[PDB]
Amino acid sequence: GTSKLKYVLQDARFFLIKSNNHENVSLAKAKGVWSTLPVNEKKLNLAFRSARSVILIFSVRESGKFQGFARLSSESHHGGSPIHWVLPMSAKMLGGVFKIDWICRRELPFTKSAHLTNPWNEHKPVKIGRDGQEIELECGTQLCLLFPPDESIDLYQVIHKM
Numbered sequence: 126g127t128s129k130l131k132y133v134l135q136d137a138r139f140f141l142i143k144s145n146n147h148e149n150v151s152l153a154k155a156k157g158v159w160s161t162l163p164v165n166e167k168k169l170n171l172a173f174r175s176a177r178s179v180i181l182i183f184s185v186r187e188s189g190k191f192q193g194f195a196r197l198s199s200e201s202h203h204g205g206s207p208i209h210w211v212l213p214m215s216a217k218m219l220g221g222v223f224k225i226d227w228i229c230r231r232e233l234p235f236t237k238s239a240h241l242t243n244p245w246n247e248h249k250p251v252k253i254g255r256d257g258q259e260i261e262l263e264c265g266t267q268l269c270l271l272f273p274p275d276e277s278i279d280l281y282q283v284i285h286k287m
């Protein structure tokens with residue numbers, strides 16, 4: 126069902142993550158981590174302390190789809206087991222590492238979210254956005270509910286964290 130998802134998403138904040146390649150979304154799905162540029166990592170760290178949940182929604186560029194979404198379970202931190210991200214630029218330019226819990230690892234095509242606009246990007250369709258763009262509450266919730274259920278995920282332990 127979708128009740129515990131709705132509960133997780135309640136009063137959440139959402140941010141559009143854009144990846145240049147599939148390999149980085151695969152590493153994120155395998156290791157439960159994300160790293161970004163410091164201008165974005167600064168935005169996420171502030172959002173993490175302010176919201177019950179901070180939801181990242183991933184799209185690989187030129188893929189035409191979102192690849193799922195995840196919930197931040199920490200602020201960024203430095204000095205961890207390094208992550209072999211594929212970069213255009215290398216290594217140091219990325220800030221710290223965020224720990225994330227995946228809520229949906231399935232894909233959603235842009236064609237299915239064309240009725241959702243994002244007021245914080247001039248009401249352009251929610252698929253339109255720079256890496257790190259915030260998605261307003263109502264658009265962001267409805268977008269997450271469009272994803273096919275990911276039956277391999279149990280939101281009980283995610284709820285145990287907020």
Ligand SMILES: CNC(=O)c1n[nH]c2ccccc12
Nearest residue numbers: 145149160161162210213256
């Ligand atoms: C795993 N994180 C990234 O691949 C990433 N995040 N922000 C960026 C900006 C330019 C290029 C790559 C990135």
